[PDB]
Amino acid sequence: GLKLFITDDELKKVHDFEEQCIEEYFREKDDRFNSSNDERIRVTSE
Amino acid sequence: QNFELQPKLKQVFGKGLIKAAMTTGAWIFTGGVNTGVIRHVGDALKDHASKS
Known part of the structure; x- marks a missing residue:
């Protein structure tokens, strides 16, 4: 059917x-926070 | 044996070893186990695998 039984090496x-995906996504996420304008303005202030 | 370095040394030598390894795709032979000079490159690669 639509389900694809996968053997343990591609498992x-x-x-x-x-x-990789979950780590790369977290990396990007926090990069967009630490590159956002709002941050820059504040970190410059403090 | 286990040792420590200066902090201002560890920022320059640490991050500059990392960007030696990103910009050309370098190889780094170390002594393997987490002792001394390898203890500083493990903290430098801890900085690497948080920002690059």
Whole structure:
């Protein structure tokens, strides 16, 4: 069907894929906060 | 043996070793285990894997 039974080597492969994704997303997220105008204005103030 | 360095040394030597390894895609042979000179590159790579 639509479900794709996956064997254990691509099971770990989609896992370390997914670890990259979650880490890369968090990295970008916090980069957009530490590059936002609002931050710059404030960090300059303090 | 385990040692420590200066903090102003650790900012320059640490982050400059990291950007030696990003801008060209370098290889870094170390002594392997987390002792001394490898203890400083582990904290420098801790700075690497938080911002690059």
